[PDB]
Design a protein around this ligand. Structure first.
Ligand SMILES: CCCCCCCCCCCCCCCC(=O)OC[C@H](COP(=O)(O)O[C@H]1[C@H](O)[C@H](O)[C@H](O)[C@@H](O)[C@@H]1O)OC(=O)CCCCCCCCCCCCCCC
Ligand SMILES: CCCCCCCCCCCCCCCC(=O)OC[C@H](COP(=O)(O)O[C@H]1[C@H](O)[C@H](O)[C@H](O)[C@@H](O)[C@@H]1O)OC(=O)CCCCCCCCCCCCCCC
Ligand SMILES: CCCCCCCCCCCCCCCCCC(=O)OC[C@H](COP(=O)(O)OC[C@H](N)C(=O)O)OC(=O)CCCCCCCCCCCCCCCCC
Ligand SMILES: CCCCCCCCCCCCCCCCCC(=O)OC[C@H](COP(=O)(O)OC[C@H](N)C(=O)O)OC(=O)CCCCCCCCCCCCCCCCC
Ligand SMILES: CCCCCCCCCCCCCCCCCC(=O)OC[C@H](COP(=O)(O)OC[C@H](N)C(=O)O)OC(=O)CCCCCCCCCCCCCCCCC
Ligand SMILES: CCCCCCCCCCCCCCCCCC(=O)OC[C@H](COP(=O)(O)OC[C@H](N)C(=O)O)OC(=O)CCCCCCCCCCCCCCCCC
Ligand SMILES: CCCCCCCC/C=C/CCCCCCCC(=O)O[C@H](COC(=O)CCCCCCCCCCCCCCC)COP(=O)([O-])OCC[N+](C)(C)C
Ligand SMILES: CCCCCCCC/C=C/CCCCCCCC(=O)O[C@H](COC(=O)CCCCCCCCCCCCCCC)COP(=O)([O-])OCC[N+](C)(C)C
Ligand SMILES: CCCCCCCC/C=C\CCCCCCCC(=O)O[C@H](COC(=O)CCCCCCCCCCCCCCC)COP(=O)(O)OCCN
Ligand SMILES: CCCCCCCC/C=C\CCCCCCCC(=O)O[C@H](COC(=O)CCCCCCCCCCCCCCC)COP(=O)(O)OCCN
Ligand SMILES: CC(F)(F)CN1C(=O)c2[nH]nc(-c3cccc4[nH]c(=O)oc34)c2[C@@H]1c1ccc(Oc2cc(C(F)(F)F)cc(C(F)(F)F)c2)cc1
Ligand SMILES: CC(F)(F)CN1C(=O)c2[nH]nc(-c3cccc4[nH]c(=O)oc34)c2[C@@H]1c1ccc(Oc2cc(C(F)(F)F)cc(C(F)(F)F)c2)cc1
Ligand SMILES: [Ca+2]
Ligand SMILES: [Ca+2]
Lengths: 388, 388
């Protein structure tokens, strides 16, 4: 009867079910109405759309395949550890992750010219894509952009889900140093290195981690009592509940290191940090292989999507690593890992024009040193946890 | 607490679980080994395959996307009412059905020249694709081919799953007459109409229905006691059990008509028969729009695949139609219906060159008459069931 408990502990981190349902309209399935909508909409598009332009036909077909795969996801895909604001949103996020996985699998079979032609079809303008000792006080605040906003809030979310100053500060410092080193390696016109080791570590990353940890401690201490949207008498309370419907209903108490932790625990945390830094390398290298612009919708959309699938992945990884009755890895964690490895394989396959013969050796030495430093600081964290 | 029973009755026709597991090796998940296999295999292909030929790159990429979507299906897709020979096979069948659904959704946005070019890319030889009163006794047996074998066994499987002489004989006669009429309409060199109303109704379809009904009655009467493969002492018993692992473990008692049946019951059975005849029309019309050859692997592979997804679809449709606690349509039935309607939309969109202005009116009149005859014989069946 331990197998029943095992399957329950997997079903609670893979497809979490909603508790205390009051407005039952949001949760009753209407799959036949969805089928009628699908058929009538595809009928309207087939019989009324003008399909004389073939490129537009291919683009609309791709968009519609994506839309209806998200519908299939809402129907049949797993939900994850999250049931807020609605499980269907997380099913659609899982479907997007599966689509991206299959996109990378396809990309691994084309050659460099075919992948470049694909990227040039998605963005026709991709073909033509390309003084620090006087750092004034105001050119410093000029550094803060919308992407600095993104860094801040991404680190806030990461520190919220990880619940550790040590892990977050380790990954922050190590990745900022790695990025500076690679920018020195590539030509990059890489002057002004005081905007990566100071403004990016101490203000964006540091403040983001601080905010994430404060909000995480708040969410841990608070007590969750959710009254129905119906029973609220006033209107301010009603809109307050409708807004809180987009917040966590309960919060997990995260502890990566036990008092006396096994070798499996340490190895799992080390693997976690290695895959974290690997997903950090994937973005840098994919943006440098093909000359991607940071303002294009796919560029920041892919980063937002990775940050979105990172939230269930961290919860499922923590559950599998620590919970003893969770005998299976969540499917979102599986897809996150396979994407994070396929992107590295893509970077290695199409990334032979980045460095010379000696610069690749420099990259390998730095990656070995980074892995060793990660292990050293993880061991230091475990020692401090055991003795203090 | 009726909602718990509702969700259980849906989970038992959507994801049936295996009972009495003895050899637990076949049923324990190894998702991390699957992830390692995926990554190592894609690494081997990325780093060793010669990708200088682009058409081969596109073909291999398509095949690999299909393979790894079947892997994702084995991971996360629903199983259906069946758990034999293994639920993973039916998960992969569901994944194939989803891929075909998305293929049709994509096809609905291209124009006729693009779809013809797609079919010519899949089969380069598609571009160049094209005396009864003396019917000897032996040219009759010459009619029996591998496709007659397929008709026989398809009707056997259908009569096994439907459990009705009336429904099966109705659909048989009506579809054979419709096919003869359409062959008379199209030029078709449609002589020798004694091979469709006699040899195809009375011998292939009739014998198939008889065999299916006999095997269905046998499977209903028998008692299922499954000893483990381990406990069998001899070797003949072991191989007998290993062969019976590819047979049903239990059989449902099918009854479409109650003594006094509601209007919803009659309407659901009528809709069942209409979608059956619609899926029969889809094959004929898709094979006549583009000049498809019956021997090409995709031609008969698509028919085998439809016959494969027909088995869970009929069980889930019967469950939803008759069981009062089954408040949701199975997902395989959903995808079967959406495919059967999307194929008809494809036939209507790309099928404007088949008939003239008057022949389309003839087709519409015959389809109305066929629907009316279907309803009449269904009402006759219900009357005979009520009074005899
Ligand atoms: C505002 C919301 C309106 C209603 C939302 C209701 C809902 O969100 O329901 C979801 C169900 C299945 O989830 P759900 O039944 O909760 O859980 C299943 C679980 O049993 C499986 O085991 C698991 O594997 C998982 O994949 C799930 O399939 O999908 C649907 O019907 C959605 C179509 C509604 C569309 C109605 C009009 C559309 C056209 C206009
Ligand atoms: C001979 C068989 C070897 C073992 C088969 C074991 C098995 O068939 O297990 C299936 C599990 C999940 O199913 P299962 O856990 O039974 O049911 C889940 C249910 O809980 C969900 O709710 C439901 O939604 C559904 O989608 C399911 O995901 O997949 C896997 O691991 C298969 C990878 C094995 C490959 C090992 C080497 C490969 C490389 C060489
Ligand atoms: C598609 C997603 C759009 C939002 C979905 C959404 O708002 O959830 C629907 C909610 C329903 O809440 P409830 O039935 O009272 O309790 C459910 C569960 N007990 C809980 O704690 O949440 O509904 C609400 O309670 C608030 C409705 C506002 C939604 C506006 C958008
Ligand atoms: C480009 C396209 C890609 C789009 C993908 C973007 C997704 C970004 C998601 C990042 C949000 C990070 C929030 C941190 C977080 O984990 O909260 C997520 C919460 C989860 O709800 P829960 O069921 O109560 O969780 C309980 C569980 N035990 C726990 O410990 O947490 O649930 C939430 O609070 C989520 C609210 C986010 C707002 C989403 C609104 C969109 C609706 C349209
Ligand atoms: C991939 C699919 C390949 C075949 C899968 C397969 O053979 O099922 C695996 C079976 C395992 O049977 P069991 O554990 O004794 O009982 C299970 C359940 N109680 C039942 O009635 O089936 O294994 C067997 O019992 C027979 C093994 C022969 C498989 C050879 C192929
Ligand atoms: C081209 C690629 C497409 C490939 C798709 C082809 C699929 C064709 C399937 C047609 C077979 C029709 C058989 C009729 C049938 O329904 O039996 C299917 C059985 C199902 O097992 P069960 O769990 O005991 O079912 C109990 C349920 N209550 C019931 O009443 O039935 O389970 C079975 O008996 C199935 C055995 C079929 C053999 C498959 C071997 C392939 C393995 C590799
Ligand atoms: C030139 C280049 C040089 C470079 C050199 C580099 C060299 C560096 C090489 C480092 C190699 C180190 C690997 C050590 C492996 C041992 C791990 C171990 O045993 O822990 C086990 C589990 O471990 C796991 O959970 C693994 C499964 C996860 C796989 C999915 C991927 C998703 C990741 C998403 C990450 C998200 C991050 C995103 C954050 C933003 C511990 O568990 P257990 O107790 O043993 O038993 C199982 C658990 N139960 C049963 C008890 C419940
Ligand atoms: C020119 C051309 C002219 C042409 C003219 C043609 C005109 C002809 C037009 C005919 C139109 C007739 C339609 C009548 C609709 C009423 C149906 C009804 O109420 O029954 C209801 C259900 O009914 C359903 O189950 C429907 C859901 C199925 C949808 C998925 C499709 C998959 C099909 C796969 C088929 C596989 C076949 C493959 C076989 C090889 C009855 O149920 P309920 O009791 O009311 O309540 C629900 C059940 N619970 C809750 C009790 C449990
Ligand atoms: C605290 C509680 C949780 C709040 C977190 C909520 C949402 C955050 C989830 C989204 C993750 C975004 C990740 C951003 C990121 O890491 O990269 C950034 C990507 O850029 C962007 O996406 C900019 C978009 C701004 C994000 C807005 C955040 C929403 C705030 C909602 C607050 C509630 C910048 O780094 P880069 O592009 O890789 O650098 C290129 C150098 N030229
Ligand atoms: C009795 C117990 C159940 C046995 C059923 C087992 C497997 C059957 C499932 C496969 C369904 C096949 C459906 C065949 C069908 O309907 O079409 C047929 C398709 O042709 C084929 O697929 C030929 C292949 C022969 C099928 C072999 C059957 C396997 C027998 C296993 C017995 C156990 C012919 O009709 P058509 O091509 O549309 O006509 C074109 C005219 N030029
Ligand atoms: C390994 C990699 F492919 F390189 C990942 N990529 C980056 O990391 C990155 N950053 N920017 C870009 C980028 C891409 C294109 C043009 C420009 N122009 C510019 O300036 O940047 C770009 C990219 C690419 C990237 C590709 C696809 C992608 O999402 C999808 C988009 C489509 C659809 F076809 F619809 F567009 C379909 C699918 C689905 F899988 F669902 F099929 C997914 C996101 C990022
Ligand atoms: C509405 C329709 F499209 F017409 C249905 N079709 C028929 O009914 C029919 N009959 N024959 C043919 C046929 C097709 C091609 C060449 C020749 N040459 C000849 O003689 O026949 C043919 C067809 C087509 C058909 C197309 C695809 C198909 O399966 C898939 C194949 C592929 C992959 F690209 F790999 F080939 C990918 C996918 C997936 F969806 F997974 F992406 C599905 C099965 C049938
Ligand atoms: Ca940085
Ligand atoms: Ca025929």
């Amino acid at each position: 009867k331990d197998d029943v408990n095992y399957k329950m502990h997997f079903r609670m981190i893979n497809e979490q079910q909603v508790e205390d349902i009051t407005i039952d309209f949001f949760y009753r399935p209407h799959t036949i109405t969805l089928l009628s909508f699908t058929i009538v909409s595809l009928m309207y598009f087939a019989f009324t759309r003008d399909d004389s332009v073939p490129e537009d036909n291919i683009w609309r077909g791709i968009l519609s395949v994506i839309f209806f795969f998200l519908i299939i996801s809402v129907l049949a895909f797993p939900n994850g550890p999250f049931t807020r604001p609605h499980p269907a949103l997380w099913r659609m996020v899982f479907g997007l992750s599966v689509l991206y996985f299959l996109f990378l699998v396809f990309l691994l079979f084309l050659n460099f010219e075919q992948v470049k032609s694909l990227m040039y079809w998605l963005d026709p303008n991709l073909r033509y894509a390309t003084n620090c000792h006087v750092i004034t006080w105001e050119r410093i605040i000029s550094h803060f952009d919308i992407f600095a906003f993104g860094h801040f809030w991404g680190w806030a979310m990461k520190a919220l889900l990880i619940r550790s100053y040590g892990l977050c500060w380790t990954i922050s410092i190590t990745w900022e140093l790695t990025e500076l080193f690679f920018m020195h390696l590539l030509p990059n016109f890489a002057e002004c290195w005081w905007d990566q080791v100071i403004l990016d570590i101490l203000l964006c990353n540091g403040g983001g981690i601080w905010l994430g940890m404060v909000v995480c401690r708040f969410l841990e201490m608070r007590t969750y009592h959710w009254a129905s949207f119906k029973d609220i008498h006033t209107t301010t309370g009603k809109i307050k509940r409708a807004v809180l419907q987009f917040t966590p209903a309960s919060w997990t108490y995260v502890r990566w290191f036990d008092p006396k932790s096994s070798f499996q625990r340490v190895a799992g945390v080390y693997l976690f940090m290695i895959i974290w830094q690997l997903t950090e390398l994937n973005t840098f290298f994919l943006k440098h292989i093909f000359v991607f612009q940071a303002s294009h919708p796919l560029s920041w959309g892919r980063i937002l999507f990775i940050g979105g699938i990172t939230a269930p992945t961290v919860r499922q990884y923590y559950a599998y690593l620590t919970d003893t009755q969770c005998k299976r890895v969540g499917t979102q964690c599986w897809v996150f890992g396979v994407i994070g490895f396929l992107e590295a394989i893509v970077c290695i396959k199409f990334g032979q024009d980045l460095f010379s013969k000696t610069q690749i050796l420099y990259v390998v030495l730095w990656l070995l040193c980074v892995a060793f430093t990660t292990f050293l600081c993880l061991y230091g964290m475990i020692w401090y946890a055991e003795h203090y």
